């Protein structure tokens, strides 16, 4: 798991978000974290996914948004995967991110 912009540790603590990336497996093990790791890369790779805004909290983090899944993945200034989840356009936080890029 921990190879590239990913680490097993970070993936583990963020698996709680995997359900937003099409992975409903309620179990958290090496094999599921893997599907999580994969669903993230596939997200970043999608042609429809583009950089949009940042997670102010994390200094120079860049966030990649996919208008289809409405998901966002946060990458730290150093390219390390930070976190990610699905944007809710009906919620003020979601719309604010959409209008201003501030996550």
């Amino acid at each position: 798991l921990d190879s590239g912009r990913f680490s097993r540790k970070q993936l583990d603590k963020k698996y709680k978000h995997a359900g937003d990336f099409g992975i409903s497996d309620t179990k958290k093990n090496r094999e599921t974290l893997t599907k999580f790791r994969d669903a993230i890369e596939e997200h970043l790779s999608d042609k429809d996914t583009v950089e949009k805004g940042t997670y102010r909290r994390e200094k120079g983090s860049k966030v990649y948004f996919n208008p289809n899944t409405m998901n966002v993945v946060i990458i730290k200034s150093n390219g390390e995967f930070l976190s990610g989840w699905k944007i809710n356009p009906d919620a003020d936080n979601g719309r604010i991110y959409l209008e201003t890029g501030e996550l």
Binding site: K86, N88, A91, G94
Partner: protein, 86 residues
């Protein structure tokens, strides 16, 4: 429903831990996501609780913007009050 508001109260009551609260809150948000007939106030309250949980990190070496058990509790209580759901 108010599964998220309930979780928050359960957390503030210390019936569940910050770690527990931070995980179940994601399950509840996913569940209620997209569901129609939702109350704006309740919807947004749930959103802020979700973002507060995102800042929670049990490890002592957490980032400066991240928070611990206490801190999440303060943040959560503050969020419920903000939306008048305490």
């Amino acid at each position: 429903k108010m599964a998220m508001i309930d979780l928050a109260k359960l957390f503030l009551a210390s019936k569940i831990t910050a770690i527990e609260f931070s995980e179940r809150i994601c399950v509840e948000r996913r569940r209620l996501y997209g569901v129609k007939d939702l109350s704006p106030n309740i919807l947004n309250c749930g959103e802020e609780l979700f973002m507060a949980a995102e800042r929670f990190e049990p490890d002592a070496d957490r980032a400066n913007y991240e928070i611990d058990d206490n801190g999440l509790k303060v943040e959560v209580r503050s969020i419920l009050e903000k939306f008048k759901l305490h």
